[PDB]
Amino acid sequence: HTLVWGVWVNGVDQGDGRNIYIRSPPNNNPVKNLTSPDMTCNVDNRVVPKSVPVNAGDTLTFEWYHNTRDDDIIASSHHGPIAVYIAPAASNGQGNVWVKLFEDAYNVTNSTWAVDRLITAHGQHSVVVPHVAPGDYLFRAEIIALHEADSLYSQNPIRGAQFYISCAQITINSSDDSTPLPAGVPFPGAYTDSTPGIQFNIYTTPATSYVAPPPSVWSGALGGSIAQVGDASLE
Numbered sequence: 001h002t003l004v005w006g007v008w009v010n011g012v013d014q015g016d017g018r019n020i021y022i023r024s025p026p027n028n029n030p031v032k033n034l035t036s037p038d039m040t041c042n043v044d045n046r047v048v049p050k051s052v053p054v055n056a057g058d059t060l061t062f063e064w065y066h067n068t069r070d071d072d073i074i075a076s077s078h079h080g081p082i083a084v085y086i087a088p089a090a091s092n093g094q095g096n097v098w099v100k101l102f103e104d105a106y107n108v109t110n111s112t113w114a115v116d117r118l119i120t121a122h123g124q125h126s127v128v129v130p131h132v133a134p135g136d137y138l139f140r141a142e143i144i145a146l147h148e149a150d151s152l153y154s155q156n157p158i159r160g161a162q163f164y165i166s167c168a169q170i171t172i173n174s175s176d177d178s179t180p181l182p183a184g185v186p187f188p189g190a191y192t193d194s195t196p197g198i199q200f201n202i203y204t205t206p207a208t209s210y211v212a213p214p215p216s217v218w219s220g221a222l223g224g225s226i227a228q229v230g231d232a233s234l235e
């Protein structure tokens with residue numbers, strides 16, 4: 001159970017975004033139903049009053065929390081991958097609109113899941129704003145927690161993969177549009193029971209064999225990381 005507090009831009013906190021620039025749900029409960037419209041932007045998908053201004057090449061950082069800011073972030077049991085998608089705001093996340101800008105599952109070297117390191121980074125992970133057409137966008141951050149993913153929610157509704165999904169309203173102002181945004185996948189839609197990554201046993205199978213759900217990351221992506229870029233105690 002985890003939620004988004006806000007975002008930083010080039011290492012500068014934009015302040016609390018909850019129900020302001022984030023289309024926040026009422027609580028930190030996971031989405032589990034792969035055919036639910038909750039898969040798009042979670043349970044309360046509506047326009048919020050603000051959109052964060054960025055320019056192509058900026059670092060956009062998501063800051064997650066559990067109950068209060070800079071807490072335990074998310075339970076350690078929730079080992080799993082982390083991804084970020086983008087889509088034009090006008091779609092409302094409907095249709096084949098979601099392009100992937102980031103994927104992190106398991107780092108072989110450190111023997112750490114993305115989630116594990118998100119805790120160490122005080123809830124912070126980032127992406128670099130790609131050179132797309134100026135305008136309004138939704139950035140969809142998605143954490144998959146695999147601790148009950150040896151079962152499927154369709155077969156057993158009290159188990160299965162857990163999605164923590166947060167959509168942020170972002171206005172790209174300055175971009176040459178040299179990497180115009182391609183076609184994407186649908187949410188709900190891109191993940192099914194058969195999709196690699198959805199069903200997995202993290203207690204028996206080695207993490208080095210885990211394959212995260214497609215699609216793959218777009219060439220137009222300029223990269224990102226899981227790592228603290230800002231100190232919230234300084235505020």
Ligand SMILES: *[C@@H]1O[C@H](CO)[C@@H](O)[C@H](O)[C@H]1NC(C)=O
Nearest residue numbers: 033034035036037153154157
């Ligand atoms: C999952 O969501 C779909 C679409 O909203 C709905 O038909 C179905 O009732 C849901 N399944 C469960 C078990 O809640």
Ligand SMILES: *[C@@H]1O[C@H](CO)[C@@H](O)[C@H](O)[C@H]1NC(C)=O
Nearest residue numbers: 107109110111112117226227
């Ligand atoms: C691995 O762990 C060390 C600390 O134990 C950290 O300094 C290093 O950045 C980690 N490597 C990554 C994030 O790939």
Ligand SMILES: [Cu+2]
Nearest residue numbers: 001002075078
């Ligand atoms: Cu949880």
